[PDB]
Ligand binder design. Structure first.
Ligand code: HC1
Ligand code: HC1
Ligand code: SF4
Ligand code: SF4
Ligand code: SF4
Ligand code: SF4
Ligand code: SF4
Ligand code: SF4
Ligand code: SF4
Ligand code: SF4
Ligand code: FES
Ligand code: FES
Lengths: 571, 571
């Protein structure tokens, strides 16, 4: 910690050595514009829109310039403003401008910068960008709106370590493409959605399914049911002017009821069911002591990565379905018979903060259990379209009999929650007594680190457990495990860094501390429930005693389990 | 007060007879979209975008439909949504879409409605609107972005009673125009700016002078000074996410200092100077008892209306200049000599919430005292462009020696404040003692009524005063006065209803209660000052004792007075 002296706009500043001009001037309440830099990535130097003027009189980029003693910097001289205006005019001279038709309307950064830096008349009119738009599955790519900032390539290469996309061509005709413009499905993409989360323009977007939902609601011979993800209730309020991490569960239930859905449920019931199934499977595997370690299967992107890159780990993957598909099977196989509705006349809609769920819902092995999948942004758009005000709503509760949940299933939206809940159930199953007091929380698996390791002692038996949030950390853990350095018993993997609260379907943010706020909100929501264990749920016991009669039973194995196949297209 | 009961979306509602469907459904927290209706105007029925479905199955506009007993209304049926989408597609099929170049970017209502009601692909592509844009002075009109809602015509005809514009042509080729497409200067326009304040698109806007200010700041052989209007400090914070009526004086002074201005002053000093001059003139006129009544001259639009429509009242108008021109003359005739700057090397910039000041600054009789005029929105745009954060600024004070002001000059941004301050000074001048306690406030001239008439007794002498906010009320008062029903002694007129806080240069609002909030903020700001009288100002006494030596003196009459001419172009 050694400090340096500098003058920014006539004000003395104390910053540590190595800090750039941008981070040094941030402490004076000055925001320098920039489009190609993000808090997760190294500086690139492509937009050239953050230039400042030093004492000599030259323009220098302030995003990758280290600080020095005795430096004089000017940030709002007329020359800098003129250069920024010219650069933005150069960008906007070759933009296809359907801001009426653009999904990123009122959320674009190029539009906001064009407004703020006072552009009203483009002098450069001529050749534009013109390409062809092709379907890439659940991701929509329009190369006519690209500004070539490299954020998607950098996030896919530096952080995710997948390297599914790169630059193509050179000069005015450069663009982002997969090898030979092949569709993303058979490329090395695993459908995590982090590239869609950082794009500053409307080039990368989502595939919408709202029209099918509206045409199924208007159908007078169908019943529509909806399920809500645990992580949607802490980030939905951001779209309506609230702070991150504020619970809007009752408001969102009331809004969904006002939208026309006949029955509103939650996925945490399926989360408890999956917890019970997985804990029973883990106990049986530990008794047998075969096929170690055991990996979870709740993340579709992790399953895709296993199928594509590591096809030798398939026997070690847990066969339990994800909570979404389990809920779909429950609704279309048990609830319909109780109510008296034919299987062909029931519609199931899910609201998820993920993008791999859109692809997962269309897999042939699930027999079309879930008919449509939405995101948080799509739900917010629907709520705003219908005209409901969100601030002044009245709190309501979930429907019956698949609405009540516990606290162990409320922390699946953050990294390490699934492991904590599994340990909570496994301690009770193995020992027979219930944890009381502060022993319920396992503080050794909480945080935002890369690889988290722990050793929980259960009545004299020690289990080696691990958690790895992120694809890169997952690859590192796999390399560590395969070499035989150490042996584990249960491993969790999540494709997004920080858990499902950082998914590609969450509302856009500008605060650099959204992860901490959302994690705090999730933990606070967990702390305010009457039940904190999965086996204390009441409707799960009824479902077992009425339809399946035992976990891992023949009917359960037929309807609540799945199998995986290798997708490795050898070349 | 009789109530009517109906069913809206399955919810029972009890409203008074005569309320429309829109105002009845507003009480359930439901916002029905609409573009052609405003809180100041009668329903028109042009956009057809607020349709709802009744029990019979037809579509009825909910903005001009009275409520009835036993009515069933559906607001979010699929048919209504489809109709709204088709109507908006029909609008956007013929729009010139330079949303990069549009002044109303991020503030347009058509853009927000295109976003919310989920438009992504226009099926109707063909002929568009194409016209020619011509200069109309301080108002910018682009007929390629008009949606023909009639708000400007209705506000000019129903409320202002001027009728300067109307519809032209018919069908697809209809547009808004003056007789024979003549420029607005020689039409019946008085430059109030209320039509610019209600337009929902970017068709109507104001002319910008930012480039000249930047090119004069970069000039190393000039000194730039700025003056701020009393009403800018209660509405500038709205642009940065604050509530109306919040005082941001110190924050705005700090921001202006960081913007490059060498010296920052305020107009309230000139307001006190004008108060002294006007009170002396009124006392002399009362002693002489000639040319009654006496009208104020602080509103340029009122002067334009007098010159155009009522040229027989010119001898009765007070000859004192407006505070803006008085401040300009003071800066360019007294401050420059004290500092030692030539008259040709001084630049004066004003920030005003008015549109008529832009035209007033260019009159030949003022010898170009003020070089440029800004608005609150332009200042906010400049602040956002420079990168300063408004929320976390540090409070500062005005420069010297023309910065200190009193409380009597802080209420010129609301209707009736000028009369209150004039009475405050006139009581002291006529009697010799000073008002103390609650007698300072004259509660009989406060409110938002049309014509406010009072009767103030000053030591046995009774004076008749009248206040008329609005052009229509001004015409009514003139008709009352001319017929000889009664005689007054002092009359105030403001062209905008509610005072200068409703000017055409203020930031856009959506709350229907902005006038009350801004008036409360202005009064609270007035209540928190140490001095509440104009003769108690200290720098005014120095200016008199050093330069002019007496109010209404030869030098003062030469530099602080003006004359008016008839603009009535007979036909
Ligand atoms: O399936 C499942 Fe789930 O370790 C998981 O993963 S957590 Fe959910 O806050 C939902 O829907 C989310 O997001 S229920 C999923 O994705
Ligand atoms: O000139 C003058 Fe003035 O009764 C007046 O009128 S009040 Fe001002 O809040 C300013 O600038 C404002 O607005 S100083 C003017 O328009
Ligand atoms: S979805 Fe993930 S793997 Fe696919 S391109 Fe984007 S960042 Fe790379
Ligand atoms: S697709 Fe988006 S993130 Fe990738 S280079 Fe283009 S603008 Fe940047
Ligand atoms: S990417 Fe941004 S600038 Fe381009 S059309 Fe979409 S909203 Fe407008
Ligand atoms: S971690 Fe969650 S949000 Fe991310 S890919 Fe997996 S399921 Fe989707
Ligand atoms: S500025 Fe006033 S008078 Fe002129 S057209 Fe607009 S509303 Fe009418
Ligand atoms: S100019 Fe504006 S207010 Fe007047 S009709 Fe056109 S859109 Fe409406
Ligand atoms: S008026 Fe509205 S929709 Fe039209 S160009 Fe301007 S911002 Fe876009
Ligand atoms: S009342 Fe004020 S804002 Fe309105 S025209 Fe007159 S000076 Fe301008
Ligand atoms: S942010 Fe510095 S060059 Fe892009
Ligand atoms: S608001 Fe009802 S028709 Fe325009």
């Amino acid at each position: 910690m050694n400090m340096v002296m500098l003058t920014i706009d006539g004000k003395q500043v104390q910053v540590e050595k190595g800090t750039t001009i941008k981070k040094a001037a941030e402490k004076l309440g000055i925001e320098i514009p920039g489009l190609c830099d993000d808090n997760d990535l190294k500086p690139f130097g492509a937009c050239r829109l953050c230039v400042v003027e030093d004492a000599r009189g030259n323009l220098v980029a302030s995003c990758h310039t280290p600080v020095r003693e005795g430096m004089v910097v000017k940030t709002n001289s007329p020359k800098v403003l003129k250069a920024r205006r010219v650069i933005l005019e150069l960008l906007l001279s070759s933009h296809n401008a359907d801001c009426f038709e653009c999904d990123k309307n009122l959320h674009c950064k190029l539009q906001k910068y064009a407004y703020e830096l006072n552009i009203r008349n483009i002098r450069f009119k001529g050749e534009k960008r013109n390409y062809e738009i092709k379907d890439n599955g659940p991701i929509y790519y329009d190369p006519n709106k690209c500004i070539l900032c490299g954020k998607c390539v950098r996030i896919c290469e530096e952080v995710q370590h997948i390297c599914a996309i790169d630059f193509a061509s050179r000069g005015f005709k450069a663009y982002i493409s997969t090898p030979f413009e092949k569709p993303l499905l058979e490329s090395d993409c695993i459908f995590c959605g982090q590239c869609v989360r950082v794009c500053p323009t409307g080039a990368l977007a989502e595939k919408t399914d709202i029209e099918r939902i509206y045409e199924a609601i208007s159908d007078p011979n169908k019943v529509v049911v909806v399920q809500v993800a645990p992580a949607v209730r802490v980030a939905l309020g951001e779209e309506f002017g609230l702070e991150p991490g504020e619970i809007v569960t009752g408001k969102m239930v009331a809004a969904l009821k006002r939208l026309g859905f006949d029955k509103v449920f939650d996925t945490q019931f399926a989360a408890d069911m999956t917890i019970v199934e997985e804990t029973a499977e883990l106990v049986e595997r530990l008794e047998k002591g075969e096929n170690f370690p055991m990996f979870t299967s709740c993340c579709p992107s992790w399953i895709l990565a296993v199928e594509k890159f590591y096809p030798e780990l398939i026997p070690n993957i847990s066969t339990a379905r994800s909570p979404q598909q389990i809920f779909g099977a429950i609704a279309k196989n048990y609830y319909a018979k109780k109510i008296g509705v034919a299987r062909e006349n029931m519609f199931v809609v899910s609201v998820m903060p993920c993008i791999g769920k859109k692809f997962e819902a269309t897999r042939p092995e699930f027999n079309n259990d879930v008919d449509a999948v939405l995101t948080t942004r799509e739900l917010a758009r629907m709520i705003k379209e219908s005209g409901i005000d969100f601030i002044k709503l009245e709190e309501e509760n979930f429907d019956s009999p698949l609405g009540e949940s516990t606290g162990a299933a409320a922390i699946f939206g953050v990294t390490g929650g699934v492991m904590e809940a599994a340990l909570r159930t496994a301690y009770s199953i193995m020992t027979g007594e219930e944890l009381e007091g502060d022993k319920i929380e396992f503080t050794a698996v909480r945080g935002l680190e890369g690889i988290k390791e722990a050793e929980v002692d259960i009545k004299g038996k020690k289990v080696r457990i691990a958690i790895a949030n992120g694809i890169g950390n997952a690859k590192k853990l796999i390399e560590k495990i395969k070499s035989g350095e150490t042996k584990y018993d249960f491993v969790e993997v999540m494709a997004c860094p920080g858990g499902c609260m950082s998914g590609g379907g969450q509302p856009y943010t500008d605060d650099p501390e959204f992860r901490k706020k959302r994690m705090e909100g999730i933990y606070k929501n967990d702390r305010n429930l009457p039940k904190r264990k999965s086996h204390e749920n009441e409707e799960v016991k009824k479902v077992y005693e009425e339809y399946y009669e035992k976990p891992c039973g023949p009917k359960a194995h037929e309807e609540l389990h799945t199998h995986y196949h290798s997708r490795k297209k050898e070349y």
